[PDB]
Design an enzyme around this catalytic site. Structure first.
Site, PDB file in Angstrom:
ATOM      1  CG  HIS A  99      -4.511 -12.136  -4.513  1.00 44.72           C
ATOM      2  ND1 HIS A  99      -3.549 -12.243  -5.797  1.00 44.72           N
ATOM      3  CD2 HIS A  99      -3.849 -10.849  -4.685  1.00 44.72           C
ATOM      4  CE1 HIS A  99      -2.952 -11.415  -6.280  1.00 44.72           C
ATOM      5  NE2 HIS A  99      -2.946 -10.560  -5.617  1.00 44.72           N
TER       6      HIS A  99
HETATM    7  C1  LIG Z   1      -1.242  -4.193   3.196  1.00 46.74           C
HETATM    8  C2  LIG Z   1      -2.321  -4.658   2.888  1.00 46.74           C
HETATM    9  C3  LIG Z   1      -2.352  -5.674   2.478  1.00 46.74           C
HETATM   10  C4  LIG Z   1      -3.176  -6.196   1.695  1.00 46.74           C
HETATM   11  N1  LIG Z   1      -3.606  -7.641   1.769  1.00 46.74           N
HETATM   12  C5  LIG Z   1      -3.856  -8.303   0.597  1.00 46.74           C
HETATM   13  C6  LIG Z   1      -4.398  -9.402   0.464  1.00 46.74           C
HETATM   14  O1  LIG Z   1      -3.161 -10.231   0.932  1.00 46.74           O
HETATM   15  N2  LIG Z   1      -4.963 -10.258   0.278  1.00 46.74           N
HETATM   16  C7  LIG Z   1      -6.328  -9.457  -0.802  1.00 46.74           C
HETATM   17  O2  LIG Z   1      -7.388  -9.975  -1.186  1.00 46.74           O
HETATM   18  N3  LIG Z   1      -6.604  -8.166  -0.396  1.00 46.74           N
HETATM   19  C8  LIG Z   1      -5.570  -7.570   0.528  1.00 46.74           C
HETATM   20  N4  LIG Z   1      -5.357  -6.096   0.491  1.00 46.74           N
HETATM   21  C9  LIG Z   1      -6.516  -5.591   0.552  1.00 46.74           C
HETATM   22  C10 LIG Z   1      -6.857  -4.989  -1.072  1.00 46.74           C
HETATM   23  O3  LIG Z   1      -5.165  -4.342  -1.970  1.00 46.74           O
HETATM   24  C11 LIG Z   1      -6.838  -3.825  -1.700  1.00 46.74           C
HETATM   25  O4  LIG Z   1      -8.414  -4.509  -1.275  1.00 46.74           O
HETATM   26  C12 LIG Z   1      -7.742  -3.917  -2.929  1.00 46.74           C
HETATM   27  O5  LIG Z   1      -6.474  -3.041  -3.976  1.00 46.74           O
HETATM   28  C13 LIG Z   1      -9.078  -3.020  -3.523  1.00 46.74           C
HETATM   29  O6  LIG Z   1      -8.878  -2.632  -5.051  1.00 46.74           O
HETATM   30  P1  LIG Z   1      -9.676  -1.274  -5.400  1.00 46.74           P
HETATM   31  O7  LIG Z   1     -10.311  -1.590  -7.338  1.00 46.74           O
HETATM   32  O8  LIG Z   1     -11.205  -1.256  -4.351  1.00 46.74           O
HETATM   33  O9  LIG Z   1      -9.120  -0.328  -4.957  1.00 46.74           O
HETATM   34  P2  LIG Z   1      -7.003  -0.574  -5.028  1.00 46.74           P
HETATM   35  O10 LIG Z   1      -6.813  -1.172  -6.114  1.00 46.74           O
HETATM   36  O11 LIG Z   1      -6.278   0.476  -4.531  1.00 46.74           O
HETATM   37  O12 LIG Z   1      -7.155   0.986  -6.323  1.00 46.74           O
HETATM   38  C14 LIG Z   1      -7.006   1.950  -6.084  1.00 46.74           C
HETATM   39  C15 LIG Z   1      -6.160   2.962  -7.009  1.00 46.74           C
HETATM   40  O13 LIG Z   1      -6.742   4.516  -7.304  1.00 46.74           O
HETATM   41  C16 LIG Z   1      -5.642   5.020  -7.481  1.00 46.74           C
HETATM   42  N5  LIG Z   1      -6.251   6.932  -7.589  1.00 46.74           N
HETATM   43  C17 LIG Z   1      -6.825   7.163  -5.308  1.00 46.74           C
HETATM   44  N6  LIG Z   1      -7.654   8.192  -5.860  1.00 46.74           N
HETATM   45  C18 LIG Z   1      -8.106   8.293  -7.085  1.00 46.74           C
HETATM   46  C19 LIG Z   1      -7.846   9.535  -7.735  1.00 46.74           C
HETATM   47  N7  LIG Z   1      -8.963  10.987  -6.810  1.00 46.74           N
HETATM   48  N8  LIG Z   1      -7.799   9.742  -9.336  1.00 46.74           N
HETATM   49  C20 LIG Z   1      -6.914   8.644  -9.663  1.00 46.74           C
HETATM   50  N9  LIG Z   1      -6.653   7.838  -9.173  1.00 46.74           N
HETATM   51  C21 LIG Z   1      -6.871   7.369  -8.061  1.00 46.74           C
HETATM   52  C22 LIG Z   1      -5.031   4.606  -6.324  1.00 46.74           C
HETATM   53  O14 LIG Z   1      -3.954   5.606  -6.738  1.00 46.74           O
HETATM   54  C23 LIG Z   1      -4.939   2.939  -6.296  1.00 46.74           C
HETATM   55  O15 LIG Z   1      -4.400   3.107  -7.131  1.00 46.74           O
HETATM   56  C24 LIG Z   1      -4.499  -5.847   1.267  1.00 46.74           C
HETATM   57  C25 LIG Z   1      -4.449  -4.376   1.281  1.00 46.74           C
HETATM   58  C26 LIG Z   1      -3.177  -3.653   2.015  1.00 46.74           C
HETATM   59  C27 LIG Z   1      -3.307  -2.339   2.587  1.00 46.74           C
END
Ligand SMILES: Cc1cc2nc3c(=O)[nH]c(=O)nc-3n(C[C@H](O)[C@H](O)[C@H](O)COP(=O)(O)OP(=O)(O)OC[C@H]3O[C@@H](n4cnc5c(N)ncnc54)[C@H](O)[C@@H]3O)c2cc1C
Ligand SMILES: Cc1cc2nc3c(=O)[nH]c(=O)nc-3n(C[C@H](O)[C@H](O)[C@H](O)COP(=O)(O)OP(=O)(O)OC[C@H]3O[C@@H](n4cnc5c(N)ncnc54)[C@H](O)[C@@H]3O)c2cc1C
Ligand SMILES: COC(=O)c1cccc(NS(C)(=O)=O)c1
Ligand SMILES: COC(=O)c1cccc(NS(C)(=O)=O)c1
Ligand SMILES: [Br-]
Ligand SMILES: [Mg+2]
Ligand SMILES: [Mg+2]
EC number: 1.8.1.12
Lengths: 483, 486
Positions: free
Chosen positions: B459
């Site tokens: 992705h």
């Molecule tokens: C610059 C950058 C580029 C990236 N590029 C890629 C890529 O090209 N391809 C790829 O596969 N991955 C990529 N990643 C990694 C990817 O974004 C993450 O692995 C993914 O978003 C993690 O998903 P998740 O469900 O763990 O958390 P996230 O998608 O980070 O969601 C966590 C959410 O929880 C919320 N939150 C946090 N604490 C609280 C709280 N206490 N109460 C309520 N809400 C809260 C936040 O607001 C956030 O929306 C990238 C990351 C970054 C920073």
């Protein structure tokens, strides 16, 4: 209010889990996030980090940065235009990106509005007790209570957050979060880190820098992109350098001070100095557990602050689970999504499934980009008596003519030489992220090198190199490289 | 003058066979071709049709053509320049392509000198007898013998040649051969045919046309790109139209005359006329069998005119084999190469192996391009009781920002719904040809839809769509299309 499942974090993993639980298994689901759309102050929002300040906007901005190469490369193919009229309008890029991200924000809003038994709550989620999520005004646990959500089951899916080195002048530096909202493109920028975020942003900044600008990338270790194939690490270093990026290896910031004109004076541990308009720290991402008040239920954390989980994403507390970056394993959106789906199938479907974190296809949207799946040879060589490396490396023809003669395509296949089983495939060059996807499917089917070289090429492609390698370039026997 | 193997045609199939025999099995190989480098008069040369007047130059020219889209699309990402200053220098492109192809011609010359046994002969190969090839000065059987070659084994690898319809004024028309050497980019061009060569050249001409230019593609039947996925045929048609190409379907030239200014007056069978600067015929390619004098040794040809071969590329005459376009099957370079590699691994390696003509990945460098492997659903539906079609079609996000909203990406997976086996994968959009290569490996491994959907996505990519499809869009049950199974 009472829910079958409460999801803290409306991100990649949290939304997959919440939607599946509500729509596939007919559970009543609550999801909590701190913001309904992208950007300051909290950056991530409804949709998660990838949507708001990660994969989605960064891919759009790298696509934008690629036109610097296309505009220059067009000349080799006879394209003519007034080079001195060329401007990279960063404001237009940021506005385009902001609209694309907000449209996704809005669609997720519509999804919660239109999906019965799937409810969104705005604010800061934490654990009051093992069956109660409290949603508060702010990250401060003394802030006002907006909701208290009774939960049979609780999913921690709060993702990760940029790591900032506690150095003097840290407050004068930014992370990737702020980089997405710079109102003007920096003339001089230091990206700090050798990881994908540093390299990808070095490329973005390099394309959009105003005239007489300079992009510098600094890394403590000797060679950027640890964890990637070593030939590709060396070649991507060469190809960044060739496009005007200064790669400072064996260098780290000691402190940052403001020059009188408000620019950033960088002191590197080597004593050395750099004056830049922006210092972007991309040295690591840490799991976001601080705000969850996990002390209230005794969920086991690692010293790092990741939620500890079994292969089924189960914490030490029954009915409380964690998926995605908060687990500090593979920080990829599709991995978070896979973990969320596997968790909901296991818990609400009694369809026991664990995410395979091996042989996961991934990319770096460097210019040019990387596509990879499975083991690098140094790792393979410790786990297998005999390892073969099949390597093809050459400036493709379009790039002799384009004038980018430095743009060598690298294609490497790592095998268990005992049976020919492909352990790893590593690609550098245009198309690499698109080529590697169906390679992921090959490795799931225990493809051997003979399955690649017996497949008929698509010609002319870069991908056909994968189907053209009959004979190893070199080997590892009992960990030792032999030509 | 005595050889283990004599190869007639130093092309995709001929050179793979020649070089493998030499370097893998230390065999003694003669390779005949009419020309050592690209272009008129014989167009193909050392390296073959693909290198000289095919895949290689075509891909460089489609890459050039793509800059028309990139220059426009850049504006959506904030690139600013004087649009009124943009010119497409065709002359520069052709000079760059010529230099690129010549370097490859010279690359192959080294190969022949730098390799024991493997020797190149210049001139026209024909069959004198079962074990003798004669190299003559011309294609006339009566021209001077330059060499007489003794052959334990003979390989026919003479490829194909453009078919020119025997209409009044065909002499005013060109093939893809001449298209590679036009001194100026045509303002108005008619590409005749609905296959990949007509479609690819319509894209090229469309990017390099001078101001007030027009590219017209005509095809005699209702829908271009017969043999490709139907959704993709309709979509390419739309996306070519959106980029200014006029698609005339159910139309076919009946004659061409020169106008007094040197332009071409095309009369269609329908009575329609059109004036153009170039008429490029791309209606088919036919095997080059005439010049080999096959009547001399009785090599059998097909009702269609290709050298008849068994699965091991063997003719009716022992010691005599045929690979690539002369066999008039799949006219692709990698198929020719595969057949050559198999024939030599068979005959000289004592390791018999047959080319698989199923599940072959291929592409059309249309703008945007096609990547395809395996069966189209209409073909699946006639072989399998229950066929599932999985389809995802959307304008990717970058192309909402780029302003090319018409660039819908199409991903189709066609399965045997009885066991989930992937029968075919059909892609339209940027990167389709690159995405599809490892799909060809998947199909060789008998990948099921669940192998795709249980693989974790990369992705963000277009390719990840292939790993996101769990539910059929529709089915064929005993040949019959329906949304739902009984
Ligand atoms: C610059 C950058 C580029 C990236 N590029 C890629 C890529 O090209 N391809 C790829 O596969 N991955 C990529 N990643 C990694 C990817 O974004 C993450 O692995 C993914 O978003 C993690 O998903 P998740 O469900 O763990 O958390 P996230 O998608 O980070 O969601 C966590 C959410 O929880 C919320 N939150 C946090 N604490 C609280 C709280 N206490 N109460 C309520 N809400 C809260 C936040 O607001 C956030 O929306 C990238 C990351 C970054 C920073
Ligand atoms: C415009 C165009 C675009 C194409 N694009 C693609 C593409 O993108 N991908 C793809 O896979 N395929 C493509 N092809 C098809 C590809 O060129 C052929 O499938 C391939 O070249 C066939 O290889 P071969 O070994 O059969 O013969 P060729 O490679 O055609 O070699 C035949 C050789 O024999 C020589 N010859 C002929 N008669 C004699 C004789 N009597 N004596 C001596 N030498 C002789 C000729 O000089 C020629 O060099 C394209 C074809 C064309 C025309
Ligand atoms: C003191 O260091 C920080 O926490 C810091 C300093 C400066 C900037 C940031 N940006 S952030 C909160 O988006 O990660 C953090
Ligand atoms: C049968 O050939 C012709 O009439 C004809 C007409 C016009 C052009 C050509 N060029 S070619 C031999 O390269 O395909 C042939
Ligand atoms: Br290192
Ligand atoms: Mg709802
Ligand atoms: Mg020699």
């Amino acid at each position: 209010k009472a829910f079958d499942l409460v999801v803290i974090g409306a991100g990649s993993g949290g939304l997959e889990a919440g939607w599946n639980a509500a729509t596939l298994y007919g559970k009543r689901v609550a999801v909590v996030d701190v913001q309904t759309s992208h950007g300051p102050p909290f950056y991530a929002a409804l949709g998660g980090t990838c949507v708001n300040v990660g994969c989605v906007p960064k891919k759009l901005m790298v696509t934008g940065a690629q036109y610097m190469d296309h505009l220059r490369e067009s000349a080799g193919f006879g394209w003519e235009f007034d080079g001195s009229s060329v401007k990279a309008n960063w404001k237009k890029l940021i506005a385009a990106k902001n609209e694309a991200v907000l449209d996704i924000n809005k669609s997720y809003e519509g999804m919660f509005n239109d999906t019965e038994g799937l409810d969104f709550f705005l604010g800061w989620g934490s654990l009051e007790s093992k069956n109660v999520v409290v949603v508060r005004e702010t990250a401060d646990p003394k802030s006002a209570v907006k909701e208290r959500l009774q939960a049979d089951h609780i999913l921690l899916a709060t993702g990760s957050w940029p790591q900032m080195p506690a150095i003097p002048g840290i407050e004068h530096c930014i992370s990737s979060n702020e980089a997405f909202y710079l109102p003007e493109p920096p003339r001089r920028v230091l990206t700090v880190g050798g990881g994908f975020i540093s390299v990808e942003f070095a490329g973005i900044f390099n394309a959009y820098k105003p005239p007489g600008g300079k992009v510098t990338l600094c890394y403590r270790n000797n060679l950027i992109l640890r964890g990637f194939d070593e030939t590709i690490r060396e070649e991507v270093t060469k190809q960044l350098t060739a496009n005007g990026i200064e790669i400072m290896t064996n260098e780290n910031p000691a402190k940052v001070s403001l020059n009188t004109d408000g620019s950033k004076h960088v002191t590197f541990e080597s004593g050395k100095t750099l004056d830049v308009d922006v210092v972007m720290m991309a040295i690591g991402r840490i799991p976001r557990t601080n705000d969850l008040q996990l002390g209230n239920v005794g969920v086991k954390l690692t010293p790092k602050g990741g939620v500890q989980v079994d292969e089924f994403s189960r914490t030490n507390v029954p009915n409380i689970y964690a998926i995605g970056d908060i687990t500090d394993r593979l920080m990829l959106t599709p991995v978070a999504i896979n973990e969320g789906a596997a968790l909901v199938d296991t818990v609400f479907g009694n369809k026991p499934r664990k995410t395979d974190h091996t042989r996961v296809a991934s990319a770096v949207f460097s210019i040019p980009p990387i596509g990879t799946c499975g083991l690098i040879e140094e790792v393979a060589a410790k786990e297998f008596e005999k390892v073969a490396v099949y390597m093809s490396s050459f400036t493709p023809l379009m790039h002799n003519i384009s004038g980018s003669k430095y743009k060598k395509f690298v294609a490497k296949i790592v095998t268990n030489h005992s049976d020919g089983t492909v352990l790893g495939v590593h690609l550098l060059g245009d198309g690499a992220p698109e080529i590697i996807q169906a390679v992921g499917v090959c490795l799931r089917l225990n493809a051997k090198i003979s399955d690649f070289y017996n497949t008929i090429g698509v010609h002319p492609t870069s991908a056909e190199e994968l189907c053209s390698m009959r004979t190893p370039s070199y080997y590892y026997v009992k960990g030792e490289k032999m030509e």
